[PDB]
Amino acid sequence: SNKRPLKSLADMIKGKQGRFRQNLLGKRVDYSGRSVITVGPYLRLHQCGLPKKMALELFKPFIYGKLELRGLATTIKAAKKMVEREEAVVWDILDEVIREHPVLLNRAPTLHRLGIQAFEPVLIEGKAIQLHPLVCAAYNADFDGDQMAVHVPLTLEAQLEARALMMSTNNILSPANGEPIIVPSQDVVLGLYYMTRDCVNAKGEGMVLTGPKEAERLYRSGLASLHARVKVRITEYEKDANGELVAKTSLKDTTVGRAILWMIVPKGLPYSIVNQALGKKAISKMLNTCYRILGLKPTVIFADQIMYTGFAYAARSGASVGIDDMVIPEKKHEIISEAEAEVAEIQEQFQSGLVTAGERYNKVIDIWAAANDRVSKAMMDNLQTETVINRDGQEEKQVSFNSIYMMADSGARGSAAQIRQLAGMRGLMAKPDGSIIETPITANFREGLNVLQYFISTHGARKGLADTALKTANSGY
Amino acid sequence: SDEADEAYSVTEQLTMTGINRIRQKINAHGIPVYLCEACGNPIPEARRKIFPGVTLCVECQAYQERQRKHYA
Amino acid sequence: DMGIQVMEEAPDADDLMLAENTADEDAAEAAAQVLSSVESEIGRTTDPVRM
Amino acid sequence: VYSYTEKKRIRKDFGKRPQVLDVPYLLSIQLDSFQKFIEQDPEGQYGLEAAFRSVFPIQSYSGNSELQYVSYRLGEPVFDVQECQIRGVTYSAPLRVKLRLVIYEREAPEGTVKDIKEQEVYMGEIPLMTDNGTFVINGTERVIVSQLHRSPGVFFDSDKGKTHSSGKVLYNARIIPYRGSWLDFEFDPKDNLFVRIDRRRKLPATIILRALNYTTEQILDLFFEKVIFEIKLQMELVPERLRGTASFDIEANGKVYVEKGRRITARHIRQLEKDDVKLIEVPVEYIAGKVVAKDYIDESTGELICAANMELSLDLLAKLSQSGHKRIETLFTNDLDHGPYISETLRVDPTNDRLSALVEIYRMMRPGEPPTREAAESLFENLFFSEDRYDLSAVGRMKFNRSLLREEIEGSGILSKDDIIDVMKKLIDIRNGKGEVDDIDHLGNRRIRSVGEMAENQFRVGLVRVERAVKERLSLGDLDTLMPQDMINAKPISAAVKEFFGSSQLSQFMDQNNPLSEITHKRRISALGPGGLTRERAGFEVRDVHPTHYGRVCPIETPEGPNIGLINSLSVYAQTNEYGFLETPYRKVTDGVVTDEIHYLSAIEEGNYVIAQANSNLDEEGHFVEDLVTCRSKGESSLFSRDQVDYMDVSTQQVVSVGASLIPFLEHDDANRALMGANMQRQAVPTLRADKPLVGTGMERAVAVDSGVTAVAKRGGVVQYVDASRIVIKVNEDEMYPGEAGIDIYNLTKYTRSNQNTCINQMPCVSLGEPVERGDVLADGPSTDLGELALGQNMRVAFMPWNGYNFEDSILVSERVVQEDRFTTIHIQELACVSRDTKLGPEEITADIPNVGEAALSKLDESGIVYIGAEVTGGDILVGKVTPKGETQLTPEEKLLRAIFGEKASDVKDSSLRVPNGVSGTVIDVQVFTRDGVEKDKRALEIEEMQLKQAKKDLSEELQILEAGLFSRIRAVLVAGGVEAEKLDKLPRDRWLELGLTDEEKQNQLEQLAEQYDELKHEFEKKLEAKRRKITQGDDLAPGVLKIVKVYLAVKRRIQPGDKMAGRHGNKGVISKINPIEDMPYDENGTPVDIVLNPLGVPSRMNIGQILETHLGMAAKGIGDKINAMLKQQQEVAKLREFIQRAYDLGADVRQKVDLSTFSDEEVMRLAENLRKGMPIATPVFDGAKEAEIKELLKLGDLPTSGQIRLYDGRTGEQFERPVTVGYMYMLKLNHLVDDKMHARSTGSYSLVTQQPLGGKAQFGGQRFGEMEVWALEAYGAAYTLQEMLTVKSDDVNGRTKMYKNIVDGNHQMEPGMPESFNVLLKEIRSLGINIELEDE
Ligand SMILES: [Mg+2]
Ligand SMILES: [Zn+2]
């Protein structure tokens, strides 16, 4: 009684609306539920903040069994009414039931098996699931409104499969390549970079501390600055043996933050692991060498301590972002005048029949790409260093503590290309066809774009977004 | 991911691959050929100073550009 | 069924590589042996109403 | 001069560019379009008149009868929009159509009619579009989106090399008609021109040129140039031809012109043209490759030596030469420019003449049938040149003539020979390199429909359906007494319009989140829908932004996700052509002077002009200040001299849409961030109390007013009486309309439910005895503030990491924002209790409910419904309903239980309406609907008497306010000339409509106003009577439902973790913590930061607009707090005037000017009190504040120019190193709430056929564990996890219950059995002829 065909037996089996496709594998499942994930940066790698209300719904039969086991509820109906009123002992029973009972957290595009991990629930107020920061890389989850589905293992065998097999502290290496998948992402690496990064003349230069404890006590009382090159006495333990762990103490030259951070590194790791700036790859390699020396328990502990200290010293960093942090180079309009002169000369030669049309197009596209490279190079050489004084009193160049640059150079977020678009010029823009519009964007974002350049950028922007929206459709083919 | 960061990567790849194609078509460093490979004519001095390493005069070049405009 | 997927518009370059190809080749032979013969008999029909 | 509601709070405005065209009425599309539809077109070409004229006059079988259309009108509806929404119907109007039937006898075909009959038959109801461009279709408010479909005309497009292996592009030209066949021409890979008629078999293109009665000589005359050789073997020369690689060298007069082998060049072309070379000589071998042009015969026998289009070889050269032939004509078939295509097509072309060509066409169209000369000719002439089978519409002919570059915008509707020969020449010219293809997303090929045109089409469909029945009924009998009421039943005419307005992809629920969302949803263009492309077939084609979108479609605003570029938003000043093509205004530029008058240009015209930029500085006389002004010509932008430029953009804003025009510093954001920011501004739910943006643009007042949320005055006057529910205005006497009573009333829309469960609620702004002028807002709508669009609240934001609490995109909100109720939103949701009649009897709304124990029934009144005033929680019974049922044989031990306790069975289910879980609101309202059979209950009679008293009070209170106003006007009439001024008040007010006065026209005025108040009285009386009839009359409830009780639960959602805040620059987040106020960062003055943000979000996401906005909001708030300090220490208005006037003129040559010197001393105190929270600031979209003016405005306050202050940690109190950026960013609460998302389930409902847990949160459903989650579980070893997700937690009906029993037993073991999905699969395979089975274990 429509325009569409009727569905038949062969249709009742085949097709994605058939039985095999999405009723024989993809099924709706009980003891489950989803919510909106938040950070919860205090958790450990093995736990997730479960809301009290989701936890009281999923673990309902377990709670009923507890109330009737402990006598707090005469029959299952009385327990039902208790946990319906949400009395005062249903909460103690929740704490007891949940105690060692993992929950599977899963996010929608399960591209790999790390899009499912067993976590121990930590009951929290509110209605958002709190997901560990170092797990977002596996989940591909940011905290701008994503949601997660929690499932509850029901059997002892599934409880032991979650604990023994899928627990978040077991899966830390990418199954595609054994590099650890617990790399700290953006506030963490910026914390560890800011603290592990010296400057030429800070408070307390060239003190000889007694060790990392004294460097921390000095910094926290504010007598020394977090990057003030001091001689510090370091005892590092090297398993250079049949696993014997010989100790060796010496006097290194490190910043105060280098030594404050040495307090968290476990025994088997050398001291050169923290004695440099510690951007992003430095931290991933730090976790990796800790794993190749010490194994899994020290590496999980190390990862948690790294996240904690990175977040703490990044908050103490006070690393904001301003408008004066986009240092547009002064030689930008000189370079653009020279490039504009070159395109005017090439257009004059083309008008005189010396070149063809497409030939001159190629020439001008090349001129603009080259001038864009000079502007980007000039701006990054302006941004990547700064002058400072000094023990004896003379000016001395050190790496810049500019904030946009510190974020791009610590590996925390950003890179010199987006930096170029922020303070250097924007460059030439594509079209959806792949052709290149030969009228460049000589402006940046610290300046503005006018209506025409903001229109021209829209071409490549909409093309990129239209592709990323459709790649999302067939993400897992 | 944010759905605009991946869009950024796509746009970056698109513009870069276009820019470098149109750059490779220039072949600035080259050989002094001094005479057209189509009509043997004298490639005038200015065209060899602008484009070091041309192989066609402007007439044969524009001719070839028309055809390669359509295709084949 | 051959199969070649008669479309209305030409497929994109990626849609050739990504599109799974099935399924040779017994049905290939059967389909070809039907198509080689269909061109000869003209009055052939399938509706019971036309018959 | 400033408006009186404008001096209340003046937004300081940067934006030096002076504004020339003021922004249009943003909803002109919907309202104009529906105006053209339902409106008396006298010279009928629009709307209903055109459809009626197109079906009528119907004429009967053999012309015995004629049904003739006289006229129409729209009967006024039964209920207005509010009554429609309450009652739940479509707010429409009856279409009463006066028709006429004339009947003819013998010998009078046109002759005298035996008799005619007039009658006004009623043909369906058309829905009425409200004053906002929205419809009410089933009580809900729809919006009909404008469509964007290809237009009739000729389109030149190529495969761009994808199809053929060599890459050779193949160009086709398609003539798409309005109705008719699709002529199409297209190249072969061999470059032969083919033509296909309806996507049918390919024929040679010149077959149709022969079908149009041409011969080969004529075809070659049309498509080619005749290189004429003469006689020896001399060649006439056109020097331009031999551009060049030159065959023969070149020579004339014997000396030389050019030597052979070397390519022909411009210098030697110059030489030939200069020396005047007409005749040169070529050998007998160069003529061996050319093509003969025309017939050539021997006079001796009259025999054909060579036809036309025949290759010319040396033998035929000799044969013609011996025939005394001096002249020879050859096709000028160059290889690059003048390619030979008609020649080769005539080679492949098997036919020769019009007969055989027509036969070929006939065989292709109507195949197999034996053709004739007559049948073939008739088919071909009926293809394109019979007026009743091929129509290029007015749009189609406009585009066909303009696309061929002709100056006849208007013309025929059928094709012609010349309209095909020009198409073929243009095709061949595109192939020759002169000319380009059409772009498909070009906005000169796509035109817009709207409600008027789509609804008119549906009405025409209904009219053709009517014509069928009327023709046949005038076929049978045609007997007298048969009138134009029995022939036309309104159902199938109204059926199409109903189906469209309700069930269509374009009729979609208006988004009411806030006013801006509605304004954008109405100004929306869609490529989808019936008539435009589908999501599956689109591309890759029209998702892309195109240069013709400038000024017409917003490049920013469009949804990201499944359809980018398929749903664009109309630009600010975009308009629709006469024909339907989008267009945009430009101020015309005479010689150098930028003239003032403005023309609208569409994407077809806009190319061939040179259009300056809106950001082009000018002298005062209108000249340009720059010699080379950057303007965009046809596709690109370059520097043109100031003499060349013809038009100039009307404004800097004219490229964006009204959504993306509300982003301050939009120029500093990456375009996709602007896309996200606009799309998220559409989603901001209105907070409890509005807060205007400290950094706006000046678009907010326009968006707030032009949408129907704020009640705007119609006439100036004084605010006679204000109230939380109504505003009464006593008009200025200049605007009285002398018949009128004088005062006009605005009734505010109090707490009501929008489509998204938000609260729409208008608040009065004015106060008693305060002036107003027409256009001033009286009532602030939901999410506006003193007339401006105020979406969220401006927060004191800090940019800094803070302990991993704003880590990926999270936000760290202070408890102080949670205390001030800044982001607290009132939500409203309606819950329906339907009592129907089941097959064992009806169900009651009683309060004598089963087992529930006299506490849950405490809220319920006697009739069983909750009180209006009660605060329920999740689980409370709103409406107690008990349902009949059978016995069902309670098992033993239940028998034994009830026998021991004597609690006999109920027989009646407790299927009542209890509040959903998690909600806790106040029950603000209860509507009841009893069918006319069901009598009524106590609550129903109570609510009816309450509505009765309200209706009577409203009518009388209106009438007495109006009576008092009219008596004031009458008393002002009675002040002179038959005057009583001191005894006028003596006699009673009712003894004034009989008041005396001298015999003037003003005693006429008194008597007139008196009898007009009498009109007020009597029409108030009929109002009361009709109101009581409607309130009392029974309801037309659905079939079977005895009565519907609707409770309206008003909840108040507060900010909490998991809620999604968001900025206007694509910076979205999710509150992760609600920090105590003493745990937050503070400055050196004791001021915590309200919200903490990640600085990491800004560099990678190139939207530094949020930083410039934070700086400007710091400056604005600094100004405003300095004002607050002055205003609180009671600094005199000398000080306030000085400082406020110094802050209102900051920045280099801004357009705005305010002079507080011309300001009443009380209007500076009001203005100061409104600027004491912060000085609002505007920053037009590509015109706003430069960073140096931000810095200056920071120096005006005592804030630092750098924008970064030094902050201290809340918990320890030790200063953060390297100061942080803190300013005021304007945050918005997006309608993605954490309690609309948090869902969970242990064990609930299970689906009927497939015994899985139900799907969704409304069904209390389970989670879809799909195929990829199964691969993830298999990639671990979790064999048991998977076996129970697939068996016990999903589908195994007998193992799920055993798992539950075991879990409450404290034994965690599953006996899984076998899934019901596989059992159903086995039975469904077994119900085919296959025998599938499970072997012995
Ligand atoms: Mg996300
Ligand atoms: Zn040459």
Curated annotation (Swiss-Prot), chain A:
Outcome of swapping residue 417 to T: Resistant to antibiotics salinamide A and B
Post-translational modification (record): Acetylated on several lysine residues in the presence of glucose.
Record's description of how this protein is used: Co-administration of salinamide and rifampicin or salinamide and myxopyronin suppresses the emergence of resistance to both antibiotics.
Residues binding Mg(2+), per UniProt: 142, 144, 146
Domain of life (superkingdom): Bacteria
Effect of residue 420 to C/H/P/S: Resistant to antibiotics salinamide A and B
Similarity field: Belongs to the RNA polymerase beta' chain family.
Subunit structure, interactors included: The RNAP catalytic core consists of 2 alpha, 1 beta, 1 beta' and 1 omega subunit. When a sigma factor is associated with the core the holoenzyme is formed, which can initiate transcription. The rRNA transcription and antitermination complex (rrnTAC) consists of RNAP, NusA, NusB, NusE (rpsJ), NusG, SubB, ribosomal protein S4, DNA and precursor rRNA; S4 is more flexible than other subunits.
Role summary: DNA-dependent RNA polymerase (RNAP) catalyzes the transcription of DNA into RNA using the four ribonucleoside triphosphates as substrates.
This protein's name: DNA-directed RNA polymerase subunit beta'
Organism: Escherichia coli (strain K12)
Residue numbers of the full-length protein present here: 319 to 795 of 1407
From Swiss-Prot, chain B:
Protein origin, superkingdom: Bacteria
Zinc finger (dksA C4-type): 36-60
PROSITE patterns assigned to the protein according to its UniProt record, in alphabetical order: ZF_DKSA_1, ZF_DKSA_2
Name of the protein: Protein TraR
Database matches in NCBIfam families: C4_traR_proteo, PRK13715.1
One Gene Ontology molecular-function label: zinc ion binding
Keywords: Metal-binding, Plasmid, Zinc, Zinc-finger
Organism: Escherichia coli (strain K12)
Coiled coil: none
PANTHER family in the record: DNAK SUPPRESSOR PROTEIN, FELS-2 PROPHAGE PROTEIN
UniProtKB/Swiss-Prot annotation, chain D:
Free-text function comment from the UniProt entry: DNA-dependent RNA polymerase catalyzes the transcription of DNA into RNA using the four ribonucleoside triphosphates as substrates.
Record field: catalytic activity: RNA(n) + a ribonucleoside 5'-triphosphate = RNA(n+1) + diphosphate
EC number(s) from the headed UniProt entry: 2.7.7.6
Residues making up the signal peptide according to the UniProt record: none
InterPro entries in the record: DNA-dir_RNA_pol_bsu_ext_1_sf, DNA-dir_RNA_pol_bsu_external_1, DNA-dir_RNA_pol_su2, DNA-dir_RNAP_su2_dom, DNA-dir_RNAP_su2_hyb_sf, RNA_pol_bsu_bac, RNA_pol_bsu_CS, RNA_pol_bsu_protrusion
Pfam families associated with the record: RNA_pol_Rpb2_1, RNA_pol_Rpb2_2, RNA_pol_Rpb2_3, RNA_pol_Rpb2_45, RNA_pol_Rpb2_6, RNA_pol_Rpb2_7
Taxonomic source organism: Escherichia coli O157:H7
EC class of the enzyme, as a word: transferase
Protein name as catalogued: DNA-directed RNA polymerase subunit beta
GO biological processes: DNA-templated transcription
Regions that span the bilayer: none
